[PDB]
């Protein structure tokens with residue numbers, strides 16, 4: 221018989237200018253300015269990424285299975301899944317926040333952080 | 340300032356045995372049996388993929404921006420997005436089926452085909 225593999229291709233969610241980028245990594249919290257040494261990190265499980273940019277409100281992204289890759293000319297965020305503050309279900313985020321499964325609570329907290337609801 | 344890139348990594352949606360795989364490509368409709376010459380195709384815009392397998396109901400996937408890659412030992416389906424018959428919103432599929440935007444109608448039709456609702 222056949223082996224079938226159904227694969228979702230890599231895809232860019234958003235790309236834009238930033239003055240500051242803040243998130244929480246396994247080695248701790250980090251803030252990346254335009255002049256920054258190259259870096260590779262793994263975001264914490266309930267990580268939120270705050271993107272500050274000239275002329276716009278902060279962009280906040282709940283991030284699931286996130287990795288960071290600060291090269292010389294880019295801050296690259298590789299995500300298993302993410303949703304932007306615009307997309308989040310504020311009700312469902314608090315529902316998943318209640319630790320049903322621990323992996324469910326991280327995605328709930330990450331989302332509450334992107335709503336500015338939790339620290 | 341910084342260039343930020345937010346990237347969703349490639350991810351395997353499903354992988355399993357199959358006896359038959361049916362879908363509609365730009366060069367026409369194709370059915371791939373265990374013994375098959377290698378092939379590369381682009382699925383049509385409102386494509387649905389039918390996976391037949393021993394001991395189970397057919398698996399149907401609405402596919403968006405799909406490509407097919409039949410190698411010697413795998414049928415690999417690369418998708419921009421997809422949803423399985425289980426996940427689809429049957430009501431919203433008919434709502435998007437009404438050609439609001441032509442790209443919206445393809446995703447609506449692809450989904451109706453995975454419900455077995457349209458041919």
Ligand SMILES: C[As](C)(=O)[O-]
Pocket residue numbers: 223225351354
């Ligand atoms: C490594 As496989 C056969 O689960 O795509």
Ligand SMILES: C[As](C)(=O)[O-]
Pocket residue numbers: 232235342344
């Ligand atoms: C090629 As680009 C700067 O839009 O990731």
